[PDB]
Amino acid sequence: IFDYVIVGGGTAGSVLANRLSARPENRVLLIEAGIDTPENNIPPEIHDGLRPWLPRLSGDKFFWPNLTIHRAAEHPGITREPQFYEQGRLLGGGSSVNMVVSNRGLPRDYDEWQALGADGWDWQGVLPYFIKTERDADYGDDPLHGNAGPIPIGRVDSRHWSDFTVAATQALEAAGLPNIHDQNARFDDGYFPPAFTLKGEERFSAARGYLDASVRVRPNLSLWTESRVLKLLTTGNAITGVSVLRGRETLQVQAREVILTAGALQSPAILLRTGIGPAADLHALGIPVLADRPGVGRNLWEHSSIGVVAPLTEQARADASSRHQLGIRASSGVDPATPSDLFLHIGADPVSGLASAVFWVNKPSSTGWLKLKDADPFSYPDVDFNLLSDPRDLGRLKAGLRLITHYFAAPSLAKYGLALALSRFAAPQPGGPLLNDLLQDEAALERYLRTNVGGVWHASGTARIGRADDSQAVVDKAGRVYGVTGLRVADASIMPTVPTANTNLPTLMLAEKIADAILT
Numbered sequence: 258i259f260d261y262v263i264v265g266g267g268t269a270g271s272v273l274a275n276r277l278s279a280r281p282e283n284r285v286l287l288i289e290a291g292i293d294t295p296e297n298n299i300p301p302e303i304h305d306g307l308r309p310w311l312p313r314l315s316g317d318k319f320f321w322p323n324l325t326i327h328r329a330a331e332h333p334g335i336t337r338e339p340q341f342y343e344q345g346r347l348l349g350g351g352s353s354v355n356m357v358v359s360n361r362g363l364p365r366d367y368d369e370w371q372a373l374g375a376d377g378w379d380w381q382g383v384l385p386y387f388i389k390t391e392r393d394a395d396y397g398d399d400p401l402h403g404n405a406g407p408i409p410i411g412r413v414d415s416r417h418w419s420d421f422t423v424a425a426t427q428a429l430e431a432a433g434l435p436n437i438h439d440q441n442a443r444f445d446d447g448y449f450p451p452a453f454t455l456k457g458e459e460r461f462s463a464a465r466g467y468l469d470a471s472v473r474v475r476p477n478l479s480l481w482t483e484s485r486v487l488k489l490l491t492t493g494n495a496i497t498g499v500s501v502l503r504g505r506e507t508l509q510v511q512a513r514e515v516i517l518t519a520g521a522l523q524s525p526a527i528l529l530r531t532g533i534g535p536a537a538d539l540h541a542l543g544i545p546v547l548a549d550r551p552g553v554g555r556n557l558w559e560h561s562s563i564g565v566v567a568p569l570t571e572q573a574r575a576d577a578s579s580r581h582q583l584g585i586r587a588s589s590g591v592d593p594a595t596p597s598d599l600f601l602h603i604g605a606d607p608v609s610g611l612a613s614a615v616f617w618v619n620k621p622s623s624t625g626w627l628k629l630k631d632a633d634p635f636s637y638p639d640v641d642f643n644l645l646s647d648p649r650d651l652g653r654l655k656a657g658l659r660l661i662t663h664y665f666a667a668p669s670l671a672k673y674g675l676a677l678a679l680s681r682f683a684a685p686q687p688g689g690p691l692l693n694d695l696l697q698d699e700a701a702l703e704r705y706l707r708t709n710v711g712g713v714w715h716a717s718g719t720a721r722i723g724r725a726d727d728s729q730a731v732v733d734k735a736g737r738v739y740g741v742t743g744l745r746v747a748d749a750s751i752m753p754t755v756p757t758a759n760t761n762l763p764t765l766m767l768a769e770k771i772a773d774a775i776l777t
């Protein structure tokens with residue numbers, strides 16, 4: 258009988274398995290559905306940190322196969338297609354297959370968490386957990402940084418920037434933007450070398466960080482790889498264990514405490530199947546109701562993304578002569594409440610022959626939801642990110658595009674004479690209209706955006722921390738699921754809102770914090 262069964266050996270699951278098992282009396286099982294990634298035998302596609310997009314070139318190999326989602330809000334005169342949503346399926350989860358960038362967001366993100374009912378999750382309260390996770394190679398001795406944590410964070414030196422990146426930076430300075438240097442302790446608009454997590458040229462997932470060999474030899478830690486949890490075992494309103502599929506064999510495992518860390522799309526599907534969710538939905542699926550919690554699978558957040566590409570002209574290609582070089586935090590101007598609501602990257606890829614300015618709404622207004630299609634443990638949920646449902650997000654994307662127009666008009670970048678066209682975010686390519694033309698035609702620009710808006714794999718919020726009297730809350734400040742015993746959620750599902758950040762570093766932090774709450 259395990260004290261803790263942790264379901265999902267991803268970003269959050271890895272931290273929890275490590276921190277909980279640090280006390281020897283704690284018998285802890287970490288169950289991960291995908292392949293193990295032993296530090297001495299990491300798949301070479303995974304292991305290459307300089308080319309972190311490589312896993313997404315192995316098709317399904319490292320993801321949840323055929324996990325499809327709806328992206329944009331349904332809207333008259335557009336037929337939406339389902340879209341494959343990458344989610345890691347292996348030890349380290351998203352941290353094993355992501356683009357290696359590691360940023361925290363803005364104080365205001367977390368102060369809003371507390372304001373929305375997550376007591377002690379304000380900036381003051383999360384910051385120790387950001388410090389504890391990291392070893393910042395550049396600023397680690399400075400006050401808002403850690404120097405001892407398991408996860409390294411570093412940035413390229415600005416002096417190593419390509420002539421192309423420099424030119425972009427001169428363009429941004431011309432618009433009045435500073436180099437803020439450290440996006441993780443400086444929180445106003447400007448540009449910077451992005452903080453990323455690598456070890457030399459190698460990926461450094463949370464499995465490398467939290468589940469190294471010494472941790473693995475702990476007699477009180479069990480690690481089940483290629484093992485899929487199918488159902489939560491209950492008695493009364495108490496979670497009591499898990500049924501797990503290994504080979505063809507299903508096992509029951511008893512547990513004092515189940516902690517779900519199965520990712521923001523699969524953690525709430527597991528709750529819903531257990532009978533924890535909106536009652537009428539569950540009734541509709543013949544699922545007996547443990548707890549009527551209507552926030553389970555609501556409040557699904559993401560960042561809403563788009564691309565601009567241009568063929569590289571000779572000057573630009575010469576100047577563009579792998580690591581994350583440049584990031585831009587900017588304000589759309591669409592809502593006073595949401596400075597720094599846009600993130601942008603400007604760079605060039607001589608390989609595809611494209612210069613790119615890709616960007617997303619980092620502080621969005623739109624949210625969607627996910628539900629079960631049926632009771633089958635094998636089904637994915639029905640997911641609808643509902644992007645651009647709130648018109649402010651459409652406003653933000655248009656603002657971003659104008660900013661790009663403005664920056665590329667600056668002498669430093671206009672000299673290249675790039676003809677910029679719209680593109681999908683995730684695999685940027687030709688085929689979209691010219692930027693200058695679309696910005697001249699508003700309805701056509703609205704239709705394009707609604708049609709081609711993407712995500713940035715920052716799914717979150719589906720089992721939100723909320724106040725103990727909030728009918729729409731799912732978990733309390735320590736991740737305990739309201740209405741049942743024996744169950745916690747401790748992944749990106751619990752974020753009351755997505756931060757102004759890529760979600761990995763915030764997921765590490767929240768797992769450290771939740772581990773602390775448990776150990777305290």
Ligand SMILES: Cc1cc2nc3c(=O)[nH]c(=O)nc-3n(C[C@H](O)[C@H](O)[C@H](O)COP(=O)(O)OP(=O)(O)OC[C@H]3O[C@@H](n4cnc5c(N)ncnc54)[C@H](O)[C@@H]3O)c2cc1C
Pocket residue numbers: 264265266267268269270288289290291313343344345346347348349350351352354355356357358359360484485486487518519520521523713714715716748749750759760761762764
């Ligand atoms: C392609 C991609 C690129 C990204 N780029 C970045 C980036 O550059 N920077 C950044 O900060 N964030 C980025 N993200 C997001 C970030 O990596 C995720 O938000 C983060 O990994 C979420 O962590 P988690 O623990 O919630 O989920 P995950 O790390 O996804 O972990 C969930 C784990 O649960 C396992 N699991 C699921 N269901 C079951 C089950 N029934 N049984 C057993 N195991 C199960 C999965 O196999 C997985 O290992 C990216 C994500 C993707 C997909």
